[PDB]
């Protein structure tokens, strides 16, 4: 049952099951604890004992993900410790080499998410396509994206973003030992995972380590250094007010989680649209994107509907406007009264139009750019829980985790199995060939695939 992989760093022990080699909880970087707490992570390239890759390892400390239960099909509890920099690898058990590699970055407002969530476990996808799929944890929350240098000149902002760099460098260094093609790395991301890839594209150090990107339902809204400073300022106020210290190093993990919860409570509700924690624009992030990599972008047809699920659960009109303003979306009071108005405004201003503009500018910048757009539009209005094509829902299909719908009174049907299986194939074939089976997106026709 055990499966041994030899690297230049040492051995790695996963499991062989049901035609797959599965490796869980590979530490890719030093644990960001003790003297490494609050700093950019250090890549792990050497271990003096074999790495036991048979168990899920801890996930970044985080508030309760209200949406995790919805996007899973059974009761689970994951351990959360600051020692959480782990990645997981799914691959077919055979002797083929130079396999296309997909690294997945989850979303979750840079607050929750983890590489071992049911929604991101790609077993069904690797079962039907001989690719290598990797998920990971990156630091989240204050611990990931507070500007800690506000408190200490040896501490860093953008820590979670440094963690994502180290996932790519580790794959670059070792994935060939698993049959992967280190010359053919696809980064795939959803929401904040998509925003993270948009950011890695503009970091020249890391940019040449990957070769294709898949962007689901996300655009780039980097925080500014001055905004991060003010949020660090208010974090220090929560520190003083509730705990009576200014020593961040004395803070316990639970202390930071409580302080973040106060900070969000004082900024007001946002349904995750207020990016309290986010990558910050710095000197090593450049202004413009490269165009050498094939890009597949996708949004869902009714993004907003999972942000604004009912007239009773909408945001207050003036709060909503404030949110969208911190996201450079100007809107008026009369146009955001109703649930339906806010859902649509999220769908159009927060996702559709920014992504369209990202693709159009890349075309203008480069005549040979390889871009595809898709709209995920599956839904069933007669259902209880899948009434429109909202944010995140397409990931159920991309990874073939249809069991999630069946746990929420939508049984699997022939159409669902076919549509998901096609999407899996489109995704895996994109990783292989850099092309989609429909016309490229160009600025005159704006062709897109509508999945349903």
Automatic annotation (TrEMBL):
Which Gene3D superfamilies does the UniProt record give?
A: alpha/beta hydrolase
Q: Give the protein name, as stated in the record.
A: Carboxylic ester hydrolase
Pfam families documented for this protein: COesterase
**Residue ranges of domain Carboxylesterase type B in the record:** 5-316
Keyword annotations from UniProtKB, A to Z: Hydrolase
Give the EC number(s) listed in the UniProt record. 3.1.1.-
Keyword check for Hydrolase: yes
Species per Swiss-Prot/TrEMBL record: Staphylococcus aureus
So what family is this one in?
A: Belongs to the type-B carboxylesterase/lipase family.
Q: Which InterPro entries match?
A: AB_hydrolase_fold (IPR029058), CarbesteraseB (IPR002018), Carboxylesterase_B_AS (IPR019826), Carboxylesterase_B_CS (IPR019819)
**GO molecular-function terms, A-Z:** hydrolase activity
